[PDB]
């Protein structure tokens, strides 16, 4: 079947009726299956709309509105799946049009209801018995209203059952694994499959890429497994499409996900934290002649993770500047910068909200690359702020440029840091001048935590350490991991407390896991299938030769097999 993309422009009219139609034709010319929604709109009168006859199937919704053309020959449209809805919960919508809508082959609507209103020239359609088409679940939302001038039309041939027909002529008058009638009882006798399809055979789901192997308790990849490209199953996704995280092919990757490439097939892995977004710094491109982050441009930094260029925060931002017509920046909006991890240029901070204590907004900043430097000198400059600690706890590298920190009368710590450990370029130097005296900081316990190493701290809390005295639970330094005790039970990997698998029972006066997996803990907390402390036995998971493998419980909570007879589980 020939495939086109579909449309979701709704009631919009793209330019001239000619330009609109010309692009409508371009989309659906010679098209058999519509992957998206079908939208026929603003079609002029006496327009050759006979090309619509090719369309056999629609995945999304069908919208026909604002048309004055006499005929709309959807003569071979067999099925509307209704994977998306136009408005409310309609799969088919015919609104404010049109004389002839001969949908003689429309046998099944898999999901959604139907709407007819304001079609003063429509004929015959009001006689169709929708109960044979729409699933009884969608009946409750049906909205059928046919009304015309007087409604003078042609009459259904007597051949028709109960006088129900789409138009003139006698030509206008199964079950499992199917949804478009049948030419007999089988998988193959279907003009349109139900759930999915693969080489004439209909199915409930495409053969899963991976299958459970009771002969090993491990997961093995079924070579007789295909993806799912819309309603069909494909051995390999078509061109430019990409594999989701549940087997299907799709055009481009999700918003909370990104594209990788295992072997040759391009796949979609979920983003580890906020997906990467590179944005332009100050004094470049979108902001070539901008002086700093102001009230105007700050919003363009939303969702940014990387910055190509520099980042300026000057007094003018908080004052506002009339000459450029830009208000005084609201300091709260600086939180937008919380998602930035990388700065390729330099970071300059000559201003900062007085009521804030540290450079909170950069608590996640990891690297300053200093490819560009202030006065060709500074990669990081923090000057004359009121802040008490810097708070760059995620900062792990300043690869080039000099670091200048001065005039912050209240700034403690800072000198506690070994900046060499961050530097990567030779000759990088640090000027830490005219801040809060060390002895003054001692006087008020403004001192690195006992749980910090001697490498210093970005602040007073234990999460502010450079490195940890003993070990680290996430971002925090701690005395010891939850070995034996503790609510979340843990094991140590590289001086770093790691959480035991959830489905592992704690233990009295003894450890409760050895590794990150379920096959690495003494006693299960729920069930047990082989080495794997599972939370619930596998009951229904497919395996080799397509056989639903079931498993039962036990008094000892061990997952035992069920007799091959049981097809629903013991």
């Amino acid at each position, epitope marked *: 079947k020939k495939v086109c993309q579909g449309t979701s422009n709704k009631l919009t009219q793209l330019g001239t009726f000619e330009d609109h139609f010309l692009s409508l034709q371009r989309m659906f010319n010679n098209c058999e299956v519509v992957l998206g929604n079908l939208e026929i709109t603003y079609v002029q009168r006496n327009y050759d709309l006979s090309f619509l006859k090719t369309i056999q199937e629609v995945a999304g919704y069908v919208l026909i509105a604002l048309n004055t053309v006499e005929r709309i020959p959807l003569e071979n449209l067999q099925i509307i799946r209704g994977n998306m809805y136009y408005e409310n919960s309609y799969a088919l919508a015919v609104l404010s049009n049109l004389k002839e809508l001969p949908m003689r082959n429309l046998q099944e609507i898999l999901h959604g209801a139907v709407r007819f209103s304001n079609n003063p020239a429509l004929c015959n359609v009001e006689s169709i018995q929708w109960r044979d088409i729409v699933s009884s679940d969608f009946l409750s939302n049906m909205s059928m209203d046919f009304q015309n001038h007087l409604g003078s039309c042609q009459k259904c041939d007597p051949s028709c059952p109960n006088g129900s027909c789409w138009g003139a002529g006698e030509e206008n008058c199964c079950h499992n694994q199917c949804a478009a009638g049948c030419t007999g009882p089988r998988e193959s006798d279907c003009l349109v499959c139900r759930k999915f399809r693969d080489e004439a055979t209909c199915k409930d789901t495409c053969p899963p890429l991976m299958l459970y192997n009771p002969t090993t308790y491990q997961m093995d990849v079924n070579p007789e497994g295909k993806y799912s490209f819309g309603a069909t199953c494909v051995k390999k996704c078509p061109r430019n499409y990409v594999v989701t995280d549940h087997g299907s092919c799709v055009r481009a990757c999700g918003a909370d996900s*990104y594209e*990788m*490439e295992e072997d040759g097939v391009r796949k979609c*892995k979920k*983003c*580890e*934290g*906020p*997906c*990467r977004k590179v944005c332009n710094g100050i004094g470049i491109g979108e902001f070539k002649d901008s002086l700093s982050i102001n009230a105007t441009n700050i919003k363009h930094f939303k969702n940014c*993770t*990387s910055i190509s260029g520099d980042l300026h925060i000057l007094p003018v931002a908080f004052r506002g500047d009339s000459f450029t017509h830009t208000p005084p920046l609201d300091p709260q909006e600086l939180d937008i910068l919380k998602t930035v*991890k*990388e700065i390729t240029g330099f970071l300059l901070i000559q201003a900062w909200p007085e009521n804030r204590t540290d450079l909170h907004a950069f608590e996640n900043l*990891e*690297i300053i*690359r200093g*490819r560009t430097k202030q006065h060709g000198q500074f990669s990081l400059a923090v000057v004359s702020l009121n802040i008490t600690s810097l708070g760059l706890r995620s900062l792990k*590298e300043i*690869s*080039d440029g000099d670091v200048i920190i001065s005039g912050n009368k209240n700034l403690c710590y800072a000198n506690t840091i070994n900046w*060499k450990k961050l*530097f*990567g*370029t*030779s000759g990088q130097k640090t000027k830490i001048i005219s801040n809060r005296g060390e002895n003054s900081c001692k006087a008020t316990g403004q001192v690195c935590h006992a749980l910090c190493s001697p490498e210093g701290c970005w602040g007073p809390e234990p999460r502010d350490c450079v490195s940890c005295r003993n070990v680290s639970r996430g971002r925090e330094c701690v005395d010891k991991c939850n070995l034996l005790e503790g609510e979340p039970r843990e094991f140590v990997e590289n001086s770093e407390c790691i959480q035991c698998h959830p489905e592992c029972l704690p233990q009295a006066m003894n450890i409760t896991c050895t590794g990150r997996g379920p096959d690495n803990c003494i006693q299960c907390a729920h069930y047990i299938d082989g080495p794997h402390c599972v939370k619930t036995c596998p009951a229904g998971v497919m395996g080799e030769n397509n056989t639903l493998v079931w498993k039962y419980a036990d008094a000892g909570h061990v997952c035992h097999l069920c007799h091959p007879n049981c097809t629903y589980g013991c």
Partner: nanobody, 116 residues
Framework: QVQLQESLSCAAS????????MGWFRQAPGKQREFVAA????????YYTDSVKGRFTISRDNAKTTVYLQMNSLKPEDTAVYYC???????????????????????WGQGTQVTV
């Protein structure tokens, strides 16, 4: 205090190169620089161009940290100068990918030139 002593051979040193990426480049005598290869140190991923695709087998070694480039089956096409570069990659960066522009690398070697 990051260093790349090069001669292939390219001894990395200066920082714990977790989530770093190290590769090689080609300096045309009558043109601009050009990518060659690259590899992540925190996961044995690699990436070549097409001109040397499969021709080279550059990988890591034992302990931190050296990166070699087995230039087997050398063709008279790669007539240029080789360089050795390194860079850090942020957590938001794809843990499967590799930058290719020279711009994307912060530390560079002193250029070695071999002729066969």
């Amino acid at each position: 205090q990051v260093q790349l002593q090069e001669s292939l051979s390219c001894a990395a040193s200066g920082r714990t190169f977790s989530s770093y990426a190290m590769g090689w480049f080609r300096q045309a005598p009558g043109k601009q620089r050009e990518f060659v290869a690259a590899i992540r140190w925190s996961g044995g991923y690699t990436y070549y161009t097409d001109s040397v695709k499969g021709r080279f087998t550059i990988s890591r070694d034992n302990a931190k940290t050296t990166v070699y480039l087995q230039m087997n089956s050398l063709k008279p096409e790669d007539t240029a100068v080789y360089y050795c570069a390194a860079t850090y990659l942020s957590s938001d960066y794809s843990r499967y990918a590799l930058p290719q522009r020279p711009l994307d690398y912060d530390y560079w070697g002193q250029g070695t030139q071999v002729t066969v």
